[PDB]
Amino acid sequence: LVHVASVEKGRSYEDFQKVYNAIALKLREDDEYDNYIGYGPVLVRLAWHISGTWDKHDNTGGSYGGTYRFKKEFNDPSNAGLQNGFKFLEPIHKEFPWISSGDLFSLGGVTAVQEMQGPKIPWRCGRVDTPEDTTPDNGRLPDADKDAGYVRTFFQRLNMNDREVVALMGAHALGKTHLKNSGYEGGGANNVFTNEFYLNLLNEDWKLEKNDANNEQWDSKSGYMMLPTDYSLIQDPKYLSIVKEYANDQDKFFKDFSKAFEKLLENGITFPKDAPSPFIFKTLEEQGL
């Protein structure tokens, strides 16, 4: 399976910056969502989940085809809650109907990260919608109740190494878990992209408790939580070193996250040698908007 990026006809940087701006303006407008967290975190999760179906072995899944729009993937139990992100993007797609679904979902994640004061994430266009029969089966996204070995093995399927995994997981600084979505509850309400996930792991007093869904999670006195898979990053000595690294260097985390997140969003895509360079979008703040 080869998926070749094909630029939406006649479109260039300015077109996608307009889409970015529309997403960013709506992020600012619809600020009440999820107890005033806003839609930032769920858009980041959406971009990750539409990418995280990828399988390096046969190039099935991945962001390219925009298959989350199809019921099988939309209704994946692993994707519970992401419907809110999709609904958010509906008026954006209506205003810019020329953008492909994969481009829109991935761009949503990039926009959210940047607007939440995270690192720049270079982004490339050219994902092309593929038919309903290309939708990957449910079950390719990760379980949260497992250990470091599970996480390591899981991410090998996405061609991610230890540093890439630990960097990507830093997105768990954002938003929260919702009992009705995933069987986990809590996490606060952060919508600013920082390295705080690593600081929280290292600095908080964690207790292994059971939540109201009878699942174990790690809770701190201060009211934070970590999934078992989050906490596994300080149980494994190789992950732990990297956690400490990012806890002590905000810039290094930003740079590594940016690389890993772009890679995640681009897995499975062949870019022609003469494709445009990756775009780096200006934030609303940078534009004075």
Residues that bind ligand HEM (CB under 6 A): 41-42, 44-45, 48, 81, 142, 144, 151, 168-169, 171-172, 174-178, 181-182, 184, 227, 229, 261
CA 207 to chain centre: 27
Q: Which listed range, 10-18, 67-75, 110-118, 220-228, lies at the site for ligand 1LZ (CB under 6 A)?
A: 220-228
Give 263: exposed, middle or buried? Use CB within 10 Å, 0-12, 13-18, 19+: middle
Cβ(98)–Cβ(8) below 8 Å: yes
User: What is the residue-wise DSSP string for 263-283?
Assistant: HHHHTTEEPPTTSPPPB-PPP
Nearest distance from C-beta of residue 240 to ligand HEM, angstroms:
16
Closer CB to ligand HEM, 95 or 209, in the complex: 209
Q: Which does 65 bind (CB under 5 to 8 A by kind): ligand HEM, ligand 1LZ, none?
A: none
CA–CA distance, 102 with 134 (Å, rounded to integer) = 13
Nearest distance from C-beta of residue 48 to ligand 1LZ, angstroms:
11
CA–CA distance, 155 with 79 (Å, rounded to integer) = 18
| Residues 186-205 close enough to bind ligand 1LZ by CB under 6 A | 187-188, 200
Q: Angle at Cα 209 formed by Cα 226 and Cα 141, nearest 5°?
A: 45
Q: Which does 83 bind (CB under 5 to 8 A by kind): ligand 1LZ, ligand HEM, none?
A: none
DSSP 55: B
Nearest distance from C-beta of residue 199 to ligand HEM, angstroms:
17
Residue nearest to ligand 1LZ (CB): 187
Binding site for ligand 1LZ (CB under 6 A): 172, 175-177, 187-188, 200, 224-227, 230
